[PDB]
Design a protein around this nucleic acid. Structure first.
Lengths: 607, 338
DNA sequence: TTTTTTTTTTTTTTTTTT
């Protein structure tokens, strides 16, 4: 009776002809949510059946197809009716807390193979609504802390994020999680040490205090010493630490030195601090082999990225003493020697053909990805240093030429066999903030003090197509997962502001400079920059309709209701399609036409 | 005027007289490498260490001076570690400060929370956690074994749980053996030792032996520690051993030895069993098999019916099955009205 | 030579009959 109602409602909402005839009927959804309101008084007889309907709707209609309209939209709408039944029933009925809350948790903890995002959404809602009403039904939480070791890692990250508003207000629940995380820090399974690392990074990220406030500082220092020990484990726990240390700084500034030395000593295992020694990172120590099983430990690319981000935040925020200049000149020596290194210092392309048969080709492939990541980090660094110096842009070009040489190496080796590996399309190490700033500086910027220095970058067309490729990759990551890979890529407001800025830049490059300026070559007619800007526009508009649905007004204001703004944008795009059509081109790029009608189909859903 | 305080002043730490924290002029690594090269390039090399640590122990005879030496320093340039941890960061100083840290720990057995409510021997063992380098690992192990023997009960409960922080990743075998040999004698310390034994790196056939050892003496445990031990036993089941341990637990648990003194502990224990079978389904089927297969023994306890009602009231696929089993206990006379 | 689309197959879910 609930699924039928949602099918009926979808059928009427999709068609005006049925809206004219049928007068607006109350649906079973609105009736059920009226029952839950009505039951406040004395109807306790009803409410134990409300709870069972809630969990039957969620259990029966939750996702599985990601681990279409008819299998999706009247099942998405029933499963979100379930959570609405249980969340409204939880709020007013003060006795079926611990019957929802120990059954939500019992489905989150124990299932962990079937998708359980809906229960983590519901548990986030339940907690966030009132941890003041959950400190009377709290022990149902701290009995699922004891099961935290055996869960997969994403469930542990998601469950800790969800239950975080309970950890803000309650000190007993925080000191009950600390005993579990400290106990599982040493446990013999692999995932238990990852879950301990995740939980300690989140307790350092979101909290200052963990009684005199000298011991809180030494507790932070002891946690940070345990995480410094975890820095000598396997590759993924190291990688989790490298993403986390930036946000540890950016909240608790006081741990500055205790993070930065922790990276700098870790940098000095893989750095050679003498000039005129041409492979300026020891790439051998990053790969361990034990009887033909061959694997990575200490990714240099993410280490350098974390160092450079923390160093930029150290310059811009902390200073407005004689430590950061050491790491500056270390990074500058890495740039200066990575410019005049070439490819036999890491024995690439000549001695090993990166074969996925032998261990040596594995080693050289890992080496190649490491050098690519290092060059991307140093591109971002050299941009970040100065106010548009020519010399640093020459170094940016030289580093990008090294990266592009390694990419053209790796692309030909995916030319004998297939491109079945998704490891060259693996993430860039440029933040979305940097790609936004780089494209604003490349296209729009016409300040005469920066023109002579940007003109060496504009003259490199392959650099500009790499830049828009990276921007398209960040929008694709925002669509596919919830959020993007870099720093500040888990805060929705920061991805929103960077989405607005990319939209503005790609619109200015699309509308102002036409398509018919193609003076490169006939291989670049499906790969032109004015095509890629329209493609990134399409991805941005789709992603902003999906994720940032409540903000579309303040999405369009950055480019009066949503109708006039959307109408002006449609006027731009449909003028573009009109001049594309009435030009009467015999070659006729139909790709640009398909993208224009796709972006118009995206836009016309707002009117 | 002592060699210790002069070397610490020229190294760059202001020694406070014993109220507030010690100040720092330079960074931590700067001070450590500075005192390292100071003791290196100084003449009379194999005696300045002994002169230094004799000056150190003569300085930490005082309560306030030693209490501030344990506590963490102050940054002038915004808060860092302690002088003892920084001083133990240097490998050539390490074993002397280890020895003169453990020799004065029996001084603080009966001393407990006088003025600032800072308990001293937990602060003494706090400085050994997460050492970057350990020289004397076997000697440190034997020193904490002598300490873990001679200690008060609260203090040995306290130091026993900070064991995996203190030790590295080598010496866990003899520690496991000595802890199990302490476990077979002392039953007051059952609760932390098992806590630590999974948290070290032992071989699994040691853990199954210790699990059998603690299930054997399950009747001789005080009331406050019983839900914690049963929590460990239920948390430490696999898929393969589960019915044997569950049957042992069914045969050993009575509630005619523990009956606001016992009713609260029984409440907590049934919370532990309820929550264990809730978040893990095979313990319910294991426990029904452990009751149903008890056919010959007409010594059925209270625990059999309370567990049949609890597996009924929780996970609700079992209902018909516990409806069936309970019918076959009543016709057969095995469960009766008394 | 690679990427996309189309067609076929398999698996899962729901309904209807014994």
């Amino acid at each position: 009776s609930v699924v039928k109602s949602f099918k009926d409602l979808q059928l009427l909402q999709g068609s005006k002809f049925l809206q004219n005839l049928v007068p607006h009927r109350s649906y079973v959804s609105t009736m059920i949510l009226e029952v839950v309101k009505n039951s406040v008084h004395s109807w306790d007889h009803v409410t134990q059946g409300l709870v069972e309907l809630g969990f039957i709707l969620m259990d029966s209609y939750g996702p599985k197809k990601v681990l279409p309209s008819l299998s999706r939209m009247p099942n998405q709408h029933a499963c979100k009716l379930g959570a609405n039944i249980l969340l409204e029933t939880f709020k007013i009925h003060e006795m079926i807390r611990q019957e929802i809350l120990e059954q939500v948790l019992n489905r989150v903890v124990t299932r962990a193979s079937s998708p359980i995002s809906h229960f983590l959404d519901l548990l986030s809602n339940i907690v966030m609504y009132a941890p003041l009403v959950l400190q009377n039904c709290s022990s149902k939480v701290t009995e699922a802390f004891d099961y935290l070791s055996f869960l997969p890692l994403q469930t542990v990250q998601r469950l800790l994020k969800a239950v975080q508003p309970l950890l803000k207000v309650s000190m007993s629940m925080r000191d009950c999680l600390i005993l579990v995380l400290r106990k599982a820090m040493f446990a013999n399974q692999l995932d238990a040490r990852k879950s301990a690392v995740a939980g300690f990074l989140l307790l350092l990220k979101n909290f200052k205090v963990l009684y005199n406030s000298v011991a809180n500082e030494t507790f932070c220092l002891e946690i940070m010493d345990s995480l410094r020990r975890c820095l000598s484990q396997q590759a993924d726990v190291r990688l989790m630490l490298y993403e986390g240390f930036y946000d540890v700084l950016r909240r608790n500034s006081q741990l500055a030195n205790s993070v930065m030395q922790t990276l700098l000593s870790q940098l000095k295992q893989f750095y050679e601090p003498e000039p005129d020694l041409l492979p300026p990172l020891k790439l051998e120590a990053c790969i361990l082999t034990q009887g033909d099983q061959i694997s990575l430990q200490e990714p240099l690319d993410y280490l350098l990225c974390c160092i450079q981000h923390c160093l930029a935040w150290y310059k811009n925020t902390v200073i407005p003493e004689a430590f950061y200049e050491d790491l500056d000149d270390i990074l500058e020596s890495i740039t200066n020697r990575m410019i005049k290194s070439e490819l036999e210092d890491f024995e690439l392309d000549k001695s090993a053909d990166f074969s996925q048969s032998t261990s040596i080709g594995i080693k050289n492939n890992i080496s190649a990805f490491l050098v690519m990541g290092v060059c991307e980090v140093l591109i971002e660094y050299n941009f970040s240093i100065s106010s548009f110096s020519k010399n640093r842009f020459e170094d940016i070009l030289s580093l990008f030429m090294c990266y592009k040489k390694l990419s053209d190496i790796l692309n030909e080796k995916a030319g004998k066999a297939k491109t079945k590996m998704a490891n060259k399309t693996s993430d860039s190490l440029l933040s979305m903030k940097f790609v936004s700033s780089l494209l604003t500086a490349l296209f729009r910027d016409s300040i005469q003090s920066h023109q002579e220095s940007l003109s060496v970058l504009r003259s490199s067309n392959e650099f500009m197509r790499y830049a828009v490729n990276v921007a398209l990759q960040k929008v694709q990551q925002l669509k596919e997962t919830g959020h993007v890979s870099g720093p500040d890529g888990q805060n929705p407001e920061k991805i929103f502001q960077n989405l607005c800025d990319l939209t503005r830049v790609l619109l200015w490059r699309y509308t102002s400079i036409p398509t018919s300026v193609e003076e490169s070559g006939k291989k670049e007619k499906g790969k032109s920059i004015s095509l890629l800007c329209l493609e990134g526009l399409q991805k941005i508009f789709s992603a902003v309709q999906q994720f940032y649905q409540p903000k579309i007004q303040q999405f369009l204001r950055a480019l009066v209701s949503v109708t006039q703004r959307t109408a002006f944008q449609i006027r731009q795009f449909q003028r573009s399609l009109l001049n594309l059509l009435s030009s009467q081109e015999e070659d006729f790029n139909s790709k640009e036409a398909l993208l224009l009608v796709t972006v118009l189909t995206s836009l016309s859903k707002l009117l | 005027d002592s060699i210790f305080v002069k070397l610490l002043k020229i190294s760059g730490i202001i020694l406070k007289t014993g109220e507030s924290q010690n100040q720092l002029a330079v960074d931590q690594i700067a001070f450590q490498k500075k005192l390292f090269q100071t003791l290196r390039r100084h003449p009379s090399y194999p005696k300045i260490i002994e002169e230094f640590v004799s000056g150190l122990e003569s300085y930490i005879e005082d309560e306030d001076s030693f209490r501030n030496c344990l506590l963490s320093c102050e940054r002038l340039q915004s808060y860092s570690k302690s002088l003892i941890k920084l001083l133990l960061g240097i490998d050539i100083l390490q074993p002397a400060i280890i020895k003169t840290l453990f020799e004065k720990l029996p001084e603080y057995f009966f001393e407990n929370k006088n003025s600032d409510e800072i308990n001293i021997p937990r602060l003494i063992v706090s400085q050994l956690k997460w050492l970057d380098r350990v020289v004397d690992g076997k000697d440190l192990t034997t020193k904490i074994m002598q300490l873990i023997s001679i200690a008060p009960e609260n203090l040995q409960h306290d130091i026993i749980t900070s064991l995996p922080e203190i030790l590295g990743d080598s010496q866990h075998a003899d520690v496991g053996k000595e802890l199990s040999d302490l476990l077979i004698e002392n039953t007051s310390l059952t609760v932390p030792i098992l806590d630590v034994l999974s948290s070290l790196r032992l071989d699994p056939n040691f853990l199954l032996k210790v699990r059998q050892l603690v299930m054997d003496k399950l009747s001789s445990i005080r009331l406050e520690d019983l839900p914690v031990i049963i929590k460990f036993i239920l948390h430490s089941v696999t898929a393969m051993d589960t019915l044997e341990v569950i049957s042992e637990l069914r045969e050993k648990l009575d509630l005619q030895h523990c009956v606001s003194s016992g009713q609260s502990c029984i409440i907590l224990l049934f919370d532990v069993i309820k929550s264990a079978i809730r978040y893990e389904k095979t313990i319910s089927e294991a426990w029904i098999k452990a009751i149903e297969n008890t056919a010959s023994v007409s010594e059925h306890k209270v625990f059999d019916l309370v567990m049949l009602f609890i597996i009924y009231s929780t996970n609700t696929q079992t209902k018909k099955y516990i409806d069936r089993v309970l019918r076959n206990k009543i016709r057969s006379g095995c469960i009766q009205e008394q």
